[PDB]
From Swiss-Prot, chain A:
The keyword Amino-acid biosynthesis does not apply. The modification Phosphoserine is found at S127. GO terms for cellular component: cytoplasm; cytosol; cytosolic ribosome; cytosolic small ribosomal subunit; extracellular exosome; focal adhesion; membrane; nucleolus. One of its GO terms (biological process) is translational initiation. The modification N6-acetyllysine is found at K32. Keywords: Acetylation, Cytoplasm, Isopeptide bond, Nucleus, Phosphoprotein, Ribonucleoprotein, Ribosomal protein, Ubl conjugation. It comes from Homo sapiens (Human). Component of the small ribosomal subunit. The ribosome is a large ribonucleoprotein complex responsible for the synthesis of proteins in the cell. Part of the small subunit (SSU) processome, first precursor of the small eukaryotic ribosomal subunit. During the assembly of the SSU processome in the nucleolus, many ribosome biogenesis factors, an RNA chaperone and ribosomal proteins associate with the nascent pre-rRNA and work in concert to generate RNA folding, modifications, rearrangements and cleavage as well as targeted degradation of pre-ribosomal RNA by the RNA exosome. Gene3D superfamilies: Ribosomal protein S7 domain. It comes from the Eukaryota. Belongs to the universal ribosomal protein uS7 family. It is found in: Cytoplasm; Nucleus, Nucleolus. This is Small ribosomal subunit protein uS7. The gene is RPS5.
Curated annotation (Swiss-Prot), chain C:
This is RNA-binding protein PNO1. One of its GO terms (molecular function) is RNA binding. Keywords: Acetylation, Nucleus, RNA-binding. Expressed in liver, lung, spleen and kidney. Weakly expressed in thymus, testis and ovary. Weakly or not expressed in heart, brain, skeletal muscle, placenta, pancreas, prostate, small intestine, colon and peripheral blood leukocytes. One of its GO terms (biological process) is ribosomal small subunit biogenesis. GO terms for cellular component: cytosol; nucleolus; nucleoplasm; nucleus; small-subunit processome. Part of the small subunit (SSU) processome, first precursor of the small eukaryotic ribosomal subunit. During the assembly of the SSU processome in the nucleolus, many ribosome biogenesis factors, an RNA chaperone and ribosomal proteins associate with the nascent pre-rRNA and work in concert to generate RNA folding, modifications, rearrangements and cleavage as well as targeted degradation of pre-ribosomal RNA by the RNA exosome. Positively regulates dimethylation of two adjacent adenosines in the loop of a conserved hairpin near the 3'-end of 18S rRNA. The lineage of its organism: Eukaryota, Metazoa, Chordata, Craniata, Vertebrata.
UniProtKB/Swiss-Prot annotation, chain D:
It comes from Homo sapiens. Detected in liver, lung, placenta, endothelial cells and spleen. A zinc finger (NOB1) spans 173-245. The modification Phosphoserine is found at S238, S265. Coiled coil: none annotated. One of its GO terms (cellular component) is cytosol. Its EC number is 3.1.-.-. Belongs to the NOB1 family. The lineage of its organism: Eukaryota, Metazoa, Chordata, Craniata, Vertebrata. This is RNA-binding protein NOB1. May play a role in mRNA degradation. Endonuclease required for processing of 20S pre-rRNA precursor and biogenesis of 40S ribosomal subunits.
From Swiss-Prot, chain E:
GO terms for biological process: cytoplasmic translation; erythrocyte differentiation; maturation of SSU-rRNA; negative regulation of transcription by RNA polymerase II; ribosomal small subunit assembly; ribosomal small subunit biogenesis; translation. The modification Phosphothreonine is found at T117. One of its GO terms (molecular function) is RNA binding. Belongs to the universal ribosomal protein uS11 family. The keyword Nucleotide-binding does not apply. One of its GO terms (cellular component) is cytosolic small ribosomal subunit. This is Small ribosomal subunit protein uS11. InterPro entries: Ribosomal_uS11, Ribosomal_uS11_CS, Ribosomal_uS11_sf.
Amino acid sequence: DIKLFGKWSTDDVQINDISLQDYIAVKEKYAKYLPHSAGRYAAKRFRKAQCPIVERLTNSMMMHGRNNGKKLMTVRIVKHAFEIIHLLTGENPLQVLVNAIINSGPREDSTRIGRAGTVRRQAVDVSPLRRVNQAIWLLCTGAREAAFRNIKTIAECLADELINAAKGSSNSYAIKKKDELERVAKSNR
Amino acid sequence: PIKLARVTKVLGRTGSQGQCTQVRVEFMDDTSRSIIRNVKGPVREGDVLTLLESEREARRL
Amino acid sequence: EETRKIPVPANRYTPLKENWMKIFTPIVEHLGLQIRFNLKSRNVEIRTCKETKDVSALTKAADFVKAFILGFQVEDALALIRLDDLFLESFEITDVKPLKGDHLSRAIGRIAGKGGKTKFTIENVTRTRIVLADVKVHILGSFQNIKMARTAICNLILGNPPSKVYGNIRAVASRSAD
Amino acid sequence: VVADAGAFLRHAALQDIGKNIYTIREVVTEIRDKATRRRLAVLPYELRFKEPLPEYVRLVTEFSKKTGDYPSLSATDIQVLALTYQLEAEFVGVSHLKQEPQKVKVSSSIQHPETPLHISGFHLPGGWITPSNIKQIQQELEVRVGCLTTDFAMQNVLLQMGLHVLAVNGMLIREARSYILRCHGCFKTTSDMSRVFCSHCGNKTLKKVSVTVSDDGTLHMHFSRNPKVLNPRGLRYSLPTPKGGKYAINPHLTEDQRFPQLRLSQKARQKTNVFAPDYIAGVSPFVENDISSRSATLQVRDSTLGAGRRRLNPNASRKKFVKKR
Amino acid sequence: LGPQVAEGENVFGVCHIFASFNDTFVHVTDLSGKETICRVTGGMKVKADRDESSPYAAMLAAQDVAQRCKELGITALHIKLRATGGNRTKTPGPGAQSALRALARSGMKIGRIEDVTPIPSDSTRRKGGRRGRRL
Ligand SMILES: [Zn+2]
């Protein structure tokens, strides 16, 4: 049977929302042994929705300038972080990741509608794909920022951010940013 | 409360810089109440959304 | 059952006859109303029936035929049966400035413009339909659009050249969050 | 059951009533409506195409040139008439139908030809348009093989010969009343209500005269004994010298005269549709007017527009600050 | 509280809708016109002088007078539409149209629409100058 990293089951995870059920591809058809697939998911529009979510997390972690080519190191980081997730919670770490992503994505956002000079932003809904993209980017950026100058390793802060985002506590940077954008949009309407 | 939405058909790209998308909205609450809405990001016909306020109507006329 | 009667003048009989099917079809299909044309009294008679969907459909039909009889396009008054914030305010030309004779005639001219161009340009800015009957001006649109249209038209018939009116009306449209 | 193109245009789904559903390929291949062609590919295919033996095509032609309907009909209409004649011949005995059609009788009255009798919404002294009447109002409505002909010339020649003609309604038609145009110079009648110049003499002289045909084979034709109709008031006026070039509008004196092309822009000849489901997201309640094209500057108009202006006679006084293009 | 009439016959009032060029009045009264049932001008709803004349305030006033009529039992209304008249404009604005529309929407049977506007036979002098008026 297909397992992530040789050990992680993928038939046990569940998607809570129907909104993101077609955009997080982890369940049955799209599970793989390693995140590193090197496939063309930026070839055409919406193709990256079929990319597995763990590879998306790996790709958005090597995003920053010095680590801009290193993916093997990043998939090592993801492997160690998922190991720490399984050690702490005991749940399947993929479900923890999915809960973090569905809990971290903003539901509406403010937009400049008008011209350059009209600073009244209108609150508009967000695409579910944009919601997933923003959730991925905020989780990676919070893990990046929390582990810049400290003894805590990147994978450790990454796992801790995933725990706070899936649990929903106000310790994750991502959920703080989500609340900020959402309340700014609710102020605009 | 939270009312989830469906995309019937995409009207077009609106906004100052074409960063908003005007779409037609179907509800999964067994109602045929289809309303126009504007969204941010990439959407297609068949997307399923999460609308926090269903009372809001888009820029109509 | 309650009814309304809408008179027709003699220059609106032939447009009422050629455009008749386009009148009575949306009234009886989408509003479910009885309609006829009393030739002896020369009235369009609109009557409620069993099949009417809701109240204030018959008022929509009355506004539809009134806007047609004043001279609007049938499509522009199908806009009345559809939309809710569309009204019609009218005035005589000599309600703004006392004009007599050729002066009054020139007033009509500089509302219309060459080819009608001025009229059409005003309609393009305020998103209204204007109709100029013999000495009388009728506007159709939203409330703020009708007051923009009156501002432009009243500047035209108190003397100002159309270029000034074009600039003023585009600026007023820009400041009005259009 | 011979289906004319009028049945396919009207979407008369009457294939369940009859079983002898036959038609020409030419009448169905000439239709330019997209919805009808879409409906053609969905319908159950029990209709069969044929072509009549040309001998009855002649015979139909020699009595149509006698009944006064020959210029009005098309070749395909002669094909439909010949097909229903042959199906009548093959199925039913041929002694039923008669030839050398009966002479018209004349009976005049006082009513103006423009009196709006037989228009549905109108009422002289109740006649209402109800939601129950819209499916009912098609025309004047009253065994094995019939016709689905809606053009009046078709029904005229059919009821002259004696073929039972039926409608979109299942029951066959007994009486058919309509209007024709007759020339007061050469006295030749046309069944085409659109046409304004005479076919024979070519003058702008056709005037409206009502006709009614019975199922028996009698045609009777009602004139109007009103001196308003034949009065030459604005018929003599002096004409400008003929002008050429791309922008000349000559006063249109002969039917087949050549005009320069002055067409409206596609933006200008677009009307606003409010029944569209994408209308309410539209910015304006109405379509924007065209003020940017060359035809806006040239003041090109739709051909139908400005009709009551033409019926004012040219030797008359318009207002002193108006100009008639 | 009201008339003691069966459910069939309607007790009519007369609705004077007067659409001025600064606000709109709604005066429901007796068929005689002498004693008044209700009158809600546009400025009783919107707390801004700019929107005294809007169709929104006209709608709100129409709901108010309709509610007060069902309080006292009036079920059907004749309507007399009116603009300022005299020297001034003769055709009623969108305020009277909106009041009529919303009042017809709110369960009222509508009788006859009559334009009682003061058209003079021959007028006094206009409030404007020779030089013109309205901007
Ligand atoms: Zn002739």
